[PDB]
């Protein structure tokens, strides 16, 4: 599944998808399309299930005239009328019992063979209807700014420190300086473009800043989680979109597995095929992987801010999709985010993502960027985003009561899902590096000093 | 380049090498056949550089004859004599200055076509003599204990603390009461088999022993070392041998990489083609990485909890040193000495083992392995393996030593390579976990508590 059909299906509900598809500069006829295709479908489940009670009666009409030891009978032809009124749905088994042992047995072959071609047409209508819902945006929440352009629309929410703050040498030069970076042929000749080695005070570094994030959430309350760096094609079909496949993930061959980009895959993965009865206390993982991205979209090709292999701790929110907690726990999760720079004294903004720039799971997303001193400029450190119950309709993680024997109950509820970046740490020693320079070197953070035997600063070679 | 010939070359050299193939249980012919690929070799050579001689002395005698005005001539055959005396080597200078400017044209292209031919018979016999030198074992240390099988071969040569005491619980069963590792099918349905999920403590474990063991090779002069996780095939197939392709490396697709099995490969291809005139003080690494292993060649053994999983941190010492004065062999002692220091740090019994000649890897000299006691299993197993690898990685990735000047003509030095495990996360969280367990739980060892927010016990739920 993609998408629950639910909403389509609601009149109120189409309406508030047309509305939210406008909003996101997005096709609202992408919802009369599905409604359309689920129409079809429809109907053919409708005759599936006519024709499977007629195969049944079938079945105990020749069980009663064998045991009544009666005789085959003339013919195994099929009355024309017969034909007709199980391609429309309308026939009765009154109808059926009439037939001889030879004629039901060859009513029954048929009605299987109508039941076969029906599955085909419902498999092709499920294919075309799951296509279409791919271009369905989440829900938009209605404080998203209304924009198609990241460069003008999104909306400044937040400052802290000097964000005009100016400095001498970028992170790249920085990093040179110290001798502690390996960008160059001997790396790139080993292992290809926007590959590294890092060396001495700055895997210290790392280090130390994988350690204070993990335990920067746990004091949070949030459940450390270590995932495997691989997935199975059709789970992180689940979790990622087409175009990942294209431009962000490596395939994997040893089934056919998938790097992840980042431990929000298998952490959302984790839950496919679970169902929470209540979530009194929402499910808080704090991830801690390498990530592995292809980049394919020659943006930011010095230095460790835009690589291909890096660590990054993430913030994972599972929670009732009841009274709009998720979206209490999303303001918890920038605060997270904005109260990690604080600690490391990184100067930044915080925006508010335009309606145009999100990716269709996110209801809305926040956006930490950091001031680089030395490049001039704000840059994206972490993002934040509330799924609410998209990415949780996709992996079928189901919340409250089933339809079945609760009269109350008329909708399947679904948890919602949020995640939000608490620390990605190559791109984060860059902001350091610049931030914490001296002319002989970079700085310590106070906060990473006992994570790193208490060193003070890195100095230049 | 696999090895370098000039020892195969040498009566003496052949010798050692043959007398070091029968010591290993291993086949001494192997240096003959070499012997004689390289003498086919030599020979498409020598012919090689005569023939460019050749064309250069066509190339000035047509120069001569233009400025003169002597007439082209009155044919381009080349006489059969000329034909025969090139193909043998033996065409001499003053022979070609004989022929007229439409021979000496037409011999230029000939010589040319003979060169090209000369150079696909060149790499097959390069092909040839590579493929055979793969199957060449490290030149024996003396003090290598001889024997094929390692249950009786192998040498005991250390022992430390309680190496007789028994346990309860074993570590899978000790890991799934903590509820603090997932191997079910919730994790191998979505990546496979032998993956896992780690939570809580144990991730807080795994972070305090990277951090540990990071720290613990710093205080020694190492220097951290952060590397890529990919590599090329060409630059693999210089730090790996033919068998781990099929057995152990997962191949990659973005140009074709392999994901390391340890950060021993792309520090040792961080070495290639570098030429270290002195190594006064040498080189010393503490490698940080995740490790990918197919395990292919276990096929359903060890599959219990995270004892022998695909994907594991290991924390890795890696030396390079002068080949001169047996220094290599003072490395070695320090290195496995570093491993013993840190399991006892981490009061965990184990045996030091000498390794058998029979079961040394083609790159290994000598071998020491720490096998630390697991007293619930009722077992040692290997933690370990420290190998002085001597001049064998620094043929194949070509790093040089010694003198580098210029004026130097055609006995070439190669600096000496030593590899060992420091801290293998997974195994020694499961050797941990045996060691430390109570009714309770799992009591933190002392050194790591600081590493773990003072944790001083990770609960049974
Ligand atoms: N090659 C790269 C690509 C990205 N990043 C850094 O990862 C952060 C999260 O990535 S995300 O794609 O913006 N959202 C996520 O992955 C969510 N799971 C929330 O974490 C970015 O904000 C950027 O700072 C990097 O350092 N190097
Ligand atoms: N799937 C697995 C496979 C191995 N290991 C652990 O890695 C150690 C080093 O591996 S090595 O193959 O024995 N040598 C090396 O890789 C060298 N570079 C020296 O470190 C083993 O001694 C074992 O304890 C594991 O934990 N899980
Ligand atoms: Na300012
Ligand atoms: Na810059
Ligand atoms: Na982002
Ligand atoms: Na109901
Ligand atoms: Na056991
Ligand atoms: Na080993």
Same mark, same amino acid.
């Given at each position: 599944?993609?998408?629950? #059909?639910?909403?389509?299906?609601?009149? *109120?509900?189409?309406?508030?998808?047309?509305?939210?598809? !406008?909003?996101?500069?997005?096709?609202?006829?992408?919802?009369?399309?599905?409604?359309?295709?689920?129409?079809?479908?429809?109907? *053919?489940?409708?005759?599936?299930?006519?024709?499977?009670?007629?195969?049944? #009666?079938?079945?105990?009409?020749?069980? /009663?005239?064998?045991?009544?030891?009666?005789?085959?009978?003339?013919?195994?032809?099929?009355?024309?009328?017969?034909?007709?009124?199980?391609?429309?749905?309308?026939?009765?088994?009154?109808?059926?019992?009439?037939?001889?042992?030879?004629?039901?047995?060859?009513?029954?072959?048929? %009605?299987?063979?109508?039941?076969? &071609?029906?599955?085909?047409?419902?498999?092709?209508?499920?294919?075309?209807?799951?296509?279409?819902?791919?271009?369905?945006?989440? #829900?938009?929440?209605?404080?998203?700014?209304?924009?198609?352009?990241?460069?003008?629309?999104?909306?400044?929410? !937040? *400052?802290?420190?000097?964000?005009?703050?100016?400095?001498?040498?970028?992170?790249?030069?920085?990093?040179?300086?110290?001798?502690?970076?390996? @960008?160059?042929?001997?790396? @790139?000749?080993?292992?290809?473009?926007?590959?590294?080695?890092?060396?001495?005070?700055?895997?210290?570094?790392?280090?130390?800043?994988?350690? +204070?994030?993990?335990?920067? %959430?746990?004091?949070?309350?949030?459940?450390?989680?270590?995932?495997?760096?691989? %997935?199975?094609?059709?789970?992180?079909?689940?979790?990622?979109?087409?175009? $990942?496949?294209?431009?962000?993930?490596?395939?994997?061959?040893?089934?056919?597995?998938?790097? #992840?980009? @980042?431990?929000?895959?298998?952490?959302?993965?984790?839950?496919? &095929?679970?169902?929470?009865?209540?979530?009194?206390?929402?499910?808080?993982?704090?991830?801690?992987?390498?990530?592995?991205?292809?980049?394919?979209?020659?943006?930011?090709?010095?230095?460790?801010?835009?690589?291909?292999?890096?660590?990054?701790?993430?913030?994972?929110?599972?929670?009732?999709?009841?009274?709009?907690?998720?979206?209490?726990?999303?303001?918890?999760?920038?605060?997270?985010?904005?109260?990690?720079?604080?600690?490391?004294?990184?100067? +930044? !903004?915080?925006?508010?993502?335009?309606?145009? /720039?999100?990716?269709?799971?996110?209801?809305?997303?926040?956006?930490?960027?950091?001031?680089?001193?030395?490049?001039?400029?704000?840059?994206?450190?972490?993002?934040?985003?509330? =799924? *609410?119950?998209?990415?949780?309709?996709?992996?079928?993680? !189901?919340?409250?009561?089933?339809?079945?024997?609760? /009269? /109350?109950?008329?909708?399947?509820?679904? =948890?919602?899902?949020?995640?939000?970046?608490?620390?990605?740490? @190559?791109?984060?020693?860059?902001?350091? =590096?610049?931030?914490? $320079?001296?002319?002989?070197?970079?700085?310590?953070?106070?906060?990473?000093?006992?994570?790193?035997?208490?060193?003070?600063?890195?100095?230049?070679?």
């Amino acid at each position: 599944m993609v998408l629950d #059909i639910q909403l389509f299906r609601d009149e *109120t509900g189409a309406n508030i998808i047309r509305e939210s598809q !406008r909003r996101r500069f997005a096709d609202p006829d992408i919802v009369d399309a599905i409604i359309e295709a689920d129409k079809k479908w429809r109907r *053919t489940q409708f005759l599936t299930e006519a024709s499977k009670k007629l195969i049944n #009666i079938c079945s105990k009409a020749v069980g /009663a005239k064998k045991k009544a030891k009666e005789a085959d009978g003339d013919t195994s032809e099929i009355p024309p009328q017969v034909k007709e009124a199980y391609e429309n749905g309308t026939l009765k088994g009154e109808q059926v019992e009439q037939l001889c042992v030879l004629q039901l047995k060859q009513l029954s072959k048929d %009605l299987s063979d109508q039941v076969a &071609g029906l599955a085909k047409e419902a498999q092709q209508l499920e294919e075309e209807r799951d296509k279409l819902m791919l271009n369905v945006g989440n #829900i938009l929440h209605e404080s998203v700014p209304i924009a198609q352009d990241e460069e003008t629309g999104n909306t400044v929410v !937040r *400052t802290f420190g000097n964000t005009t703050k100016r400095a001498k040498l970028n992170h790249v030069s920085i990093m040179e300086r110290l001798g502690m970076m390996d @960008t160059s042929k001997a790396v @790139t000749s080993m292992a290809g473009g926007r590959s590294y080695v890092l060396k001495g005070g700055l895997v210290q570094l790392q280090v130390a800043l994988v350690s +204070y994030s993990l335990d920067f %959430l746990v004091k949070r309350g949030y459940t450390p989680f270590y995932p495997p760096f691989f %997935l199975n094609r059709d789970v992180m079909g689940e979790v990622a979109q087409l175009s $990942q496949f294209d431009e962000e993930l490596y395939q994997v061959s040893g089934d056919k597995k998938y790097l #992840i980009a @980042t431990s929000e895959m298998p952490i959302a993965a984790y839950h496919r &095929g679970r169902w929470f009865t209540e979530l009194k206390e929402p499910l808080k993982y704090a991830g801690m992987s390498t990530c592995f991205r292809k980049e394919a979209g020659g943006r930011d090709t010095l230095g460790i801010f835009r690589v291909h292999q890096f660590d990054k701790i993430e913030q994972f929110v599972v929670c009732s999709p009841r009274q709009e907690e998720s979206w209490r726990h999303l303001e918890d999760m920038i605060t997270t985010s904005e109260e990690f720079n604080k600690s490391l004294g990184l100067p +930044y !903004r915080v925006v508010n993502i335009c309606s145009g /720039a999100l990716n269709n799971a996110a209801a809305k997303k926040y956006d930490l960027e950091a001031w680089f001193p030395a490049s001039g400029a704000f840059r994206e450190l972490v993002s934040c985003s509330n =799924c *609410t119950d998209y990415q949780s309709q996709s992996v079928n993680c !189901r919340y409250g009561p089933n339809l079945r024997g609760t /009269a /109350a109950q008329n909708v399947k509820e679904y =948890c919602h899902m949020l995640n939000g970046t608490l620390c990605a740490i @190559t791109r984060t020693m860059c902001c350091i =590096c610049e931030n914490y $320079q001296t002319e002989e070197g970079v700085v310590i953070p106070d906060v990473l000093r006992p994570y790193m035997m208490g060193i003070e600063m890195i100095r230049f070679e």
